[PDB]
Amino acid sequence: KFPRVKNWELGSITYDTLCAQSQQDGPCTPRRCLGSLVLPRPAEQLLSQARDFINQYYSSIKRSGSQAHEERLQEVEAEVASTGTYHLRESELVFGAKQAWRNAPRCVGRIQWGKLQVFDARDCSSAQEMFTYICNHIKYATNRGNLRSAITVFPQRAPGRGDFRIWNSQLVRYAGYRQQDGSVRGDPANVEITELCIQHGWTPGNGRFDVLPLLLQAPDEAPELFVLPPELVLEVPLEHPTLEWFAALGLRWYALPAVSNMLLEIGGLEFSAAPFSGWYMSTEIGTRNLCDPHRYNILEDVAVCMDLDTRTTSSLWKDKAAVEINLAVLHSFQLAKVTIVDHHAATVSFMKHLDNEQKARGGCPADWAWIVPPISGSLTPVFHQEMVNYILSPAFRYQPDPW
Amino acid sequence: GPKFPRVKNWELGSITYDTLCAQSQQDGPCTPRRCLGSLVLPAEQLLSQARDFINQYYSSIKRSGSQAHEERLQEVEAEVASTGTYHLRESELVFGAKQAWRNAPRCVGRIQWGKLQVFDARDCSSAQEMFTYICNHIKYATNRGNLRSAITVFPQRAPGRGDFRIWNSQLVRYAGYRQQDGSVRGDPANVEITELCIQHGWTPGNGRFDVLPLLLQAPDEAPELFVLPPELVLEVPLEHPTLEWFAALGLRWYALPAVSNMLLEIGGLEFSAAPFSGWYMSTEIGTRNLCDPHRYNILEDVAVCMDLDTRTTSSLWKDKAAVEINLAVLHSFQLAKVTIVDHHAATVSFMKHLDNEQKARGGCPADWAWIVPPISGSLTPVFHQEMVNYILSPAFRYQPDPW
Ligand code: HEM
Ligand code: HEM
Ligand SMILES: Cc1cc(N)nc(C[C@H]2CNC[C@H]2OCCNCCc2cccc(F)c2)c1
Ligand SMILES: Cc1cc(N)nc(C[C@H]2CNC[C@H]2OCCNCCc2cccc(F)c2)c1
Ligand SMILES: C[C@H](O)[C@H](O)[C@H]1CNc2nc(N)[nH]c(=O)c2N1
Ligand SMILES: C[C@H](O)[C@H](O)[C@H]1CNc2nc(N)[nH]c(=O)c2N1
Ligand SMILES: [Zn+2]
Secondary structure (H helix, E strand, C coil): CCCEEEECCCCEEEECCCHHHCCCCCCCCCCCECCCCCCCCCHHHHHHHHHHHHHHHHHHCCCCCCHHHHHHHHHHHHHHHHHCCCCCCHHHHHHHHHHHHHCCCCCCCHHHCCCCEEEECCCCCCHHHHHHHHHHHHHHHHHHHCCCCEEEECCCCCCCCCCCEECCCECCCECEEECCCCCEEECHHHHHHHHHHHHCCCCCCCCCCCECCEEEECCCCCCEEECCCCCCCCEEECCCCCCCCHHHHCCEEECCCEECCCEEEECCEEECCCCEECCCEHHHHHHHHHHCCCCCCCHHHHHHHHCCCCCCHHHCHHHHHHHHHHHHHHHHHHHHCCCCECHHHHHHHHHHHHHHHHHHCCCCECCHHHHCCCCCHHHCHHHHECCEECCCCCEEECCCCCC | CCCCCEEEECCCCCEEECCHHHHCCECCCCCCCCECCCCCCCCHHHHHHHHHHHHHHHHHCCCCCCHHHHHHHHHHHHHHHHHCCCCCCHHHHHHHHHHHHHCCCCCCCHHHCCCCEEEECCCCCCHHHHHHHHHHHHHHHHHHHCCCCEEEECCCCCCCCCCCEECCCECCCECEEECCCCCEEECHHHHHHHHHHHHCCCCCCCCCCCECCEEEECCCCCCEEECCCHHHCCEEECCCCCCCCHHHHCCEEECCCEECCCEEEECCEEECCCCEECCCEHHHHHHHHHHCCCCCCCHHHHHHHCCCCCCCHHHCHHHHHHHHHHHHHHHHHHHHCCCCECHHHHHHHHHHHHHHHHHHHCCCECCHHHHCCCCCHHHCHHHHECCEECECCCEEECCCCCC
C-alpha cells in the first residue's frame, strides 16, 4: 500500500505516507502507466474541500481544534449553505498559495516554497486594474536583478459568469512571426499568441526578440491590449566566458519567468488568473528554449561556430555546443547580476528539500521526468533517487486556452 | 477520440493511440492514486497463459483458427493434463524469445528485435556444459568486433527439480575488491559477486579491470567456477581523438554486453538461465559505468586533466568532462572496429521502431525514464515523445539472485 523509495547512489530507503492524503486521480492505472504524458484529457464536494483546507491552515499555525478554528468552520459552512460558495481570508490565501507551490510535483525550486510574496489582487474589476497589478508584480519581482519570488492572485471564478484570464502563458515571452517561406522569425512556441495579439490590433515589430504585449480579459468582456513598458522588462545579453564570437550572435533572454495561464486551487475554490514567478534554472534557457528543435534551435549554428563536425552524430557536436550555451547562460546572467541557478546546485538543493519534506510530512510528491535536468541527467543526484507522483491540494492545474 | 491512451510527440505535433495495451494481461506498479514510474524494481493459470501464447504464435504465421492451431492447443492441454508442464516446439521457442525482447519496455534496442540468433540449449545437463554453450555464445556474438545479437536458452524450470542459473549478472563483469580502508578497487557494482567467487575457490587479481569468473549452477548441484579464456573476451583500450593524455588513464571496457541473470517467461514456462547479448550504447559506458558516483566515478580525475574549475558547480566541469569521456568511448570503439552506437543515432532509430510498431500492433510499451539517455536527454527525440508502459508476455523479468 505504501511504497518503498530507494536512492540508488547511497542505498538509502524511505517511505512516502503523504500520498495517503491524495484526493485526486492522475492518469495511471495498474494496467498501464501514463506518467509521461504532459497533459491530462455540487455543494457536498465544495464544502468538504473547504473544511479540509481550513483544517490545513489551523493545523499550520498550531491553532487546530480551537475557537477561532471552530467558528471559522461555521463561517464557510454557512456561506456555502446560502450562496453556494465562500471566500478566503488574506492570510488563508497566503497559506494556500505557498502550499500550492509546496505541492507542485514538477517544481525543482520547491526548497524556496516558504519564501513567497503574495499580492492579493482580488479587489480588481477591470483589465486596466489587472495591468497595473501585473506591472507592480514585475517591478517587485525583478528587483534590479536580485530576483524575488512572487504571485498575484486575481478574483476567483464565479458560477454565473466568465473568468478573469490572462491570455499569455507567461508575462514575458517573445513574438513568433510565421513567414511566407514556411519559416519563423523568433520564438515558434508563441506564434498563435502573436497572431491573436495582431487580431486584437497590436503593432508588431519584426526582430527575433520582440517582447509580446499583454492580453488581459475581465469577466465576459473581450480581451484588451497593454504594452509592457520596456523598463519593467529586464533582459540579459548572451556572451561566452572564452568564446569572443558567441556574443556576436544577438542571443539574449529575459530575466523573469512568470507563468500566467495556470489555475490556482485552494479549498475547492479556483483562481483562473494568478500569475507567479521566481527565477530561472539555466537549463530552461540554455537547453530547452535555445536548444529544442521546435524553438529557437540554434545548436547547429553554435556548432558551425566552433568548427566541429556537423556530418556525424558520433562526434558529439550536439552535446558539446549545448554545453557552451548553458555555460553562456550562466556566465551572462552572473555578469548582469541577475539571479540564476545551474542544474547542479538546483537539484542538490532539491534533495535537501525531499529530506526536509520526508521529516515534515512523510514524503514529497514529485515527477521524476520533469525534475531531472534535460542534459547531464545522471550527473545530477536526482537521477538516482526514486520518486512518487500523486495529487495534493492546494494545487496549480492546467486550464483551457480562453479562445 | 477513442478510449485508448492518446500519445503525443511534442516536437512534431503528431498524435497516436495505443490499442496494444489492451493485450496486457498483467498489472504494473501504478494506480489512479499514485504513479510509480520511477521505481527501478517495481495449472489453471498455466493453461491460461500457454493458450494465449499459442494463439500468439499461430497468429504470427497467419494460421489462426486452423487445423494445425486447434491441434497444437489440444496437444498442449494434454501435455499439461498428465505432467503439470509442457514443452515448446523449436520454432515456438525462437518466436517467443524474439517476442520477449520486442516487449521489453526498457530497451532502446528494439528496432533490431527481428534479428536475434536463438541458440537452443534445452539439451544441457551439466554446469561443465553451460560453460561450453556460453563460450560458443561469446565467440558467435563477439564475431571479432562485428557484433551479433544472440541468446542461448538453457532448460526451463520444472516441478520439484531445482534451477539452472548463471549467478553472474552479466557474462562479462570487472571485479570489485573491497579495500581495508573502506573504498573499492574496481567496479563497486560487483563487490557482492566478487566475494562469492573467492569464497567458492577463485584466486583474485588486484586490478581495476579484472574479468570475473563464472559461477554456474545446475539443478541441486553447488555452483561451479569457470574461468573465461582471455582470448575469448574482447576489450577496448580507451583513447580520446584530441586529448592525448586520456589514453594514459589506463581506461578500458569490454565489447559484449550480455545479461545473464534475467528470467525469460514464455507461455508460463520460465527459463531461469538465458543469457542474452547485443552491442552497447556509448552512454552505458561513458556516462553510467564510468561517471556514476557509485561506480568508477572518474569525473573528477578527468576534469582535473582538463584543467576545469571543480570547486564551483556553475563551471559545468561535470558536463564538460562526461562529454569528452563519452566521445572517447565512441572513438575507442570506432578505431578497434567494435560495434557501438551513440545515444543520438540510437534514439533516432527507436523513433523509427515506434512508428513500425504503431502499424504492426497499434503501439509499443516504453519506459521513458529509461529510453531517454543519462546525458543530453532533451537533445534526443525520445525526450519529446509520450510513452505508454505496460507489461506484455513473453517477457524478460527480474529474479532474485540465487543465494
Ligand atoms: C524560485 C526559483 C524557481 C525555480 C528555479 C523553479 C523552477 C522550476 C522548473 C525548472 C520547473 C519545470 C521546468 C519546465 O517548465 O520545464 C518548474 C515548474 C513549476 N513551478 Fe517552479 N521554480 C521556481 C519558483 C517557483 C514559484 C514561485 C512557483 C509558484 C509559486 C513555482 C511553481 C511551479 C509550478 C506550479 C510548476 C509546474 C509547471 C507545469 O506543471 O507545467 N516555481 N519550476
Ligand atoms: C542490439 C543492440 C542493443 C542495444 C543498443 C540495447 C540497448 C539497451 C539499453 C540501452 C538498455 C537499458 C539498460 C540500462 O541502462 O540499464 C537495454 C535494456 C534491456 N535490453 Fe536492450 N539492447 C540491445 C540488444 C538487446 C538484446 C539482443 C536484448 C534481448 C535479446 C535486449 C533486451 C533488453 C532487456 C530485457 C532490457 C531491460 C533490462 C531491465 O529492465 O533492467 N537488448 N537494452
Ligand atoms: C515560476 C517558475 C520558475 C522557473 N524557474 N521556471 C518555471 C517554469 C517556466 C519557465 N520555463 C518553462 C516554464 O514552464 C511553464 C509550464 N510548463 C508548460 C509545459 C507545456 C508546454 C506546452 C503545452 C502544455 F500544455 C504545457 C516557473
Ligand atoms: C543486451 C544488452 C545490450 C545493451 N546495450 N545493454 C544491455 C543492458 C546491460 C548493459 N548495461 C547495463 C545492463 O543492464 C542490466 C539491467 N539491470 C540494471 C537495473 C538494475 C536492477 C536491479 C539492481 C541493479 F543494480 C540494477 C543489454
Ligand atoms: C513528454 C515528456 O513528458 C515531455 O517531453 C516533458 C519531459 N520532461 C520535461 N521536463 C521539464 N522540466 N520540462 C519539460 O517540458 C519537460 N517535457
Ligand atoms: C530512479 C530511476 O528510476 C533510476 O535511476 C533509473 C532511471 N533511468 C535509467 N535508465 C537506464 N537506461 N538505466 C538505468 O539504470 C536507469 N536508472
Ligand atoms: Zn505511472
